[PDB]
Structure 1
Amino acid sequence: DLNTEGDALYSLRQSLKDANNVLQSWDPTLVNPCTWFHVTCNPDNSVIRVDLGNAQLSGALVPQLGQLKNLQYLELYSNNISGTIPNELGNLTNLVSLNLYLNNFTGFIPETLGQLYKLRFLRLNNNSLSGSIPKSLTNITTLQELALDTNQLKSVPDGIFDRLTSLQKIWLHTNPWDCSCPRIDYLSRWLNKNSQKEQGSAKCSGSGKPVRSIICPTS
């Protein structure tokens, strides 16, 4: 009997590159992947977290990774994972923490990420993600820590942070933010009103000014 979770997890092994045989224990012919290293399962023998931080992994992620229904912690930080973030990651309903920082992800941030209504920690920092931040992120009301620094983000949809009443920390620095008025109006005012939330200082592209300092005139 094929475990389906291990099958989905084996699809990830088939595309990644070790180079260290970190995934040597990932044998899908077993009854379940709960005895796999870097993999924890619940008492119902279902994968609830994947810890592959600092494993020197190359390659791209797979759409099969969204098959893990009971996944809570996806730790893929500190690797050389390239390509775009799969939209199927928005299927991870029970995902609490998505750690994808320190990789080489490109493209846009998936709008399907807003379907993660249990997500409390989202770290996509230190990548090459281009703007802008998905509008559906406003639906993640449980979001507490949002790390998006060190990317290529340019803008923000107006009023996106307003429904985020559980937001504690937010990283936005090191990004080519478009500080042209009236586009930067909302982000400038929000970061000023929630300066205790912003970790580091988001700079404006070109001028290098903190966007919190920008005051857009009307007419």
Structure 2
Amino acid sequence: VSTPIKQIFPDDAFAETIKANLKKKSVTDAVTQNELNSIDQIIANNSDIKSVQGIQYLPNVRYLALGGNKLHDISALKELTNLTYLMLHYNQLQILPNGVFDKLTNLKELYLSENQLQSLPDGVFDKLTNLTELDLARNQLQSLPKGVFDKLTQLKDLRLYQNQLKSVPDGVFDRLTSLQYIWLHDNPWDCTCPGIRYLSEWINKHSGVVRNSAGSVAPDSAKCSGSGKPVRSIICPT
């Protein structure tokens, strides 16, 4: 049995994308499940895609680049369990549903770097024990759920720069034993002791990890709002 492409993928742009992928002539060409099972990468950055509906039927996709599109819903990605790379940078995600990543256990790189997120679901990244890079920069993040990063022990690179965080939960980074790069700058950190103790302590304890715009070791990069002074320079005392 075969089925036309735009029947499976309603979005014109994505249909054109899949057609391009399989070297077909027209979105009206029909395809066999064996042809669908051939797709292991999709490079669809900046293609005006508003919906990836139909992507559920590509079981073997490993490498998925959807950055710079107009996506607001990614529930169709749920069952793609072979996924190892997921680029969703500069799309239109205002909210992630719960358990959206619960299946994606093989993920090693996840970029959500410039969507318009405001909070994160509780335990959204917990099943991602293999993840090595997490980009959450330049969103509108207000606060982090407690122990949001607790499962991310392979993670080497965390990006939180340019958000709207004023405080992080105590001990939020403690389990990041493999962390080599973290970006904290351009947040209005509320350097009010005794609230800011853990973040000062942690930055100080791991000053080598904390990085600036140029990827250089720069533990002063995190700055108190109002003051504009380094977070780690704050001693909040007993």
Alignment of 1:95-114 (within 5 A): 95-108=107-120, 110-114=122-126
| Structure 2 match to 1:81 | 92
Counterpart residue number, 1:94: 106
Q: Which runs of 5+ in 1 are unaligned?
A: none
| 1:66 equivalent in alignment to 2:58 | no
Partner of 1:136: 148
Tell me which residue corresponds to 2:17: 25
> Between Structure 1 and Structure 2, which shows a larger proportion of strand residues?
1
Aligned Cα RMSD in Å? 2.9
Runs of 4+ deviating beyond 4 Å: none
Distance 1:86 1:23, change over 3 A: farther
- The equivalent of 1:217 in structure 2 is 237
Q: TM-score, normalised by structure 2?
A: 0.73
Question: Where does residue 43 of structure 2 map in the other structure?
Answer: 38
Q: 87-96 or 145-154: which moved more?
A: 87-96
Contact kept, 8 Å, 2:189 with 2:224, in 1: the verdict is yes
Alpha carbons of structure 1 residues 36 and 198: separation in structure 2 relative to 1, 3 Å: closer
Structure 2 residue identity aligned to 1:147: R
Tell me the SS of whatever aligns to 1:106: coil
| 35 and 172 in structure 1: CA distance in 2 versus 1, 3 angstrom threshold | closer
Percentage identity across aligned positions? Answer: 43
Q: Gaps (5+ residues) in structure 2?
A: 20-26, 45-57, 213-220
| Structure-2 separation of matches of 1:98 and 1:159 | 23
Distance 1:93 1:176, change over 3 A: same
Query: Compared with structure 1, are the counterparts of its residues 191 and 35 closer, same or farther at alpha carbon in structure 2 (3 Å cutoff)?
Result: closer
Deviation at 1:110, TM superposition (A): 4.9
Q: Distance in 1 between matches of 2:172 and 2:122?
A: 15
The SS at the match of 1:101 is coil
CA distance in 1: counterparts of 2:158 and 2:15, whole angstroms? 29
Match of residue 51 from structure 1: 65
Number of equivalenced pairs: 199
Other-structure match for 1:190: 202
Return the structure number with greater relative CO, CA threshold 8 A, min gap 6: 1
AA in 1 matched with 2:96: I
- Cα distance in structure 2, aligned partners of 1:35 and 1:95: 14
Give how far 1:186 is off: 0.7
Cα displacement string for residues 52-74 of structure 1 (whole angstroms, at most 9, x for unaligned residues): 23xx4124032232211111100
1:38 CA drift (Å)? 1.4
